[PDB]
Design a binder for this molecule. Structure first.
Ligand SMILES: [Zn+2]
Ligand SMILES: [Zn+2]
Length: 75
C-alpha cells in the first residue's frame, strides 16, 4: 500500500495515547485533577485521560486497566 509511512511510534508504556478534544468535565489520570485543556490523551484499552503531557508517569498498559476495568475481579 501507499502508506509506506506508518508512524506506529506512540507507545510510552504499552498504551496507545490518541489526541482527544476535552470540552467538558475531564480529570488527569496522571495529575488527579481537572484537565482545563482543549486536548488530552486516551488509552483505548484502559480508558484514561491525561493533560497530553503526563503520559510519562502512567503505569504499563496492563497496570492501568487493572484499575480502569469495572468488569474485573480487581480484589
Ligand atoms: Zn495531568
Ligand atoms: Zn492502556
Amino acid at each position: 500500500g501507499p502508506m509506506k509511512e506508518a508512524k506506529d511510534a506512540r507507545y510510552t508504556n504499552g498504551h496507545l495515547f490518541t489526541t482527544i478534544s476535552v470540552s467538558g468535565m475531564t480529570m488527569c489520570y496522571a495529575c488527579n485533577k481537572s484537565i482545563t485543556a482543549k486536548e488530552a490523551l486516551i488509552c483505548p484499552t484502559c480508558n484514561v485521560t491525561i493533560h497530553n503531557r503526563c503520559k510519562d508517569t502512567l503505569a504499563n498498559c496492563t497496570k492501568v486497566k487493572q484499575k480502569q476495568q469495572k468488569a474485573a475481579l480487581l480484589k
